[PDB]
Design an enzyme around this catalytic site. Sequence first.
Site, PDB file in Angstrom:
ATOM      1  N   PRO A   1       0.846  -1.212   0.000  1.00  0.00           N
ATOM      2  CG  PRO A   1      -0.824  -1.536   1.598  1.00  0.00           C
ATOM      3  CD  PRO A   1       0.583  -1.990   1.224  1.00  0.00           C
TER       4      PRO A   1
ATOM      5  CE  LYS B   1      -2.337  -6.022   1.490  1.00  0.00           C
ATOM      6  NZ  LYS B   1      -2.463  -6.550   0.096  1.00  0.00           N
TER       7      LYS B   1
ATOM      8  CB  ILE C   1      -3.188  -4.796  -4.486  1.00  0.00           C
ATOM      9  CG1 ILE C   1      -2.341  -3.961  -5.456  1.00  0.00           C
ATOM     10  CG2 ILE C   1      -3.807  -6.005  -5.177  1.00  0.00           C
ATOM     11  CD1 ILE C   1      -1.056  -4.662  -5.927  1.00  0.00           C
TER      12      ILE C   1
ATOM     13  CG  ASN D   1      -9.388  11.185  -2.814  1.00  0.00           C
ATOM     14  OD1 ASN D   1      -8.866  12.111  -3.436  1.00  0.00           O
ATOM     15  ND2 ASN D   1     -10.601  11.269  -2.298  1.00  0.00           N
TER      16      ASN D   1
END
Lengths: 114, 114, 114
Positions: A1, A32, A64, A97
Amino acid sequence: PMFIVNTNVPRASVPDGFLSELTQQLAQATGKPPQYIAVHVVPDQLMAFGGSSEPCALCSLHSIGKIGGAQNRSYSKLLCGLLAERLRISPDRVYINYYDMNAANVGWNNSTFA
Amino acid sequence: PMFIVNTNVPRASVPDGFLSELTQQLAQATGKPPQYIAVHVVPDQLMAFGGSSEPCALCSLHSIGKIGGAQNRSYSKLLCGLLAERLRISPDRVYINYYDMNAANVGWNNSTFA
Amino acid sequence: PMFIVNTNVPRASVPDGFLSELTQQLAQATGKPPQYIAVHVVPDQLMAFGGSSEPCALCSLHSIGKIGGAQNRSYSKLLCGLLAERLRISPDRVYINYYDMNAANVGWNNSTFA
């Protein structure tokens, strides 16, 4: 990320180790490994929120997977809390966002994650 | 709604009140409350358009809804007009990426808009 | 097509002609005329990758079409190749987000590409 923060807050106001803290916190929040976390802080920006030049921030978190209704609500609580505590930015003057990226659309190490 | 402008035009060439004007026009154009409009201007950038370093701009407009064929054309006319008039950038050296964001993917005030 | 690279590498480390090389190679890679290619390089950034501050890059390639599994892998090899050779950035410390944009969502010259 990957997490990016653009803010009008001065550079000197960004605490040492802020990038490290973001990395560790995001590693935990997304589950992660920290080796995959990328963080980017851009201070001293010319920006306004609601017409006001009071401290604010425009952010983005790309990942992802690990992006969804509940998770995003959770990420926002976490990130707004970090920005409020370390940069003194009011949560209501922060936009984040969220982007759920497909592995085929993320390049890395001469290829993609597909 | 949030609008970002990256340009190779120098800081000194950005007129006073520019962020203020962008906020109002976008409020009007989007039909969204002015208090929720975020604007960010990044001058002095190292960029090229068509291989040329003449004045150019790479922008983005994110919004929850209010994004579409006709609406985007209208936003482009408005925003290119402002960049031409205020920053002296030719409309044909401007790119504006439009993003229709899902409320669940926009964080604000410790939560999301969902 | 528009390509943006954000990196912690210093401005002095970005070689003369870098924007021109990116422009030409991307024109060749995407098959689109160089006149339509926009490139943006942002050095001296405050960023970390995997919790380290060694040279790294966070990039994006937006294009109306010409985005896909195989094409993205090809773009990644090309761009990481350039970043490693010109900026001395290890390919495994580079992320490139690919975006296949709809023509109606890209503003240019007072209108959109629709």
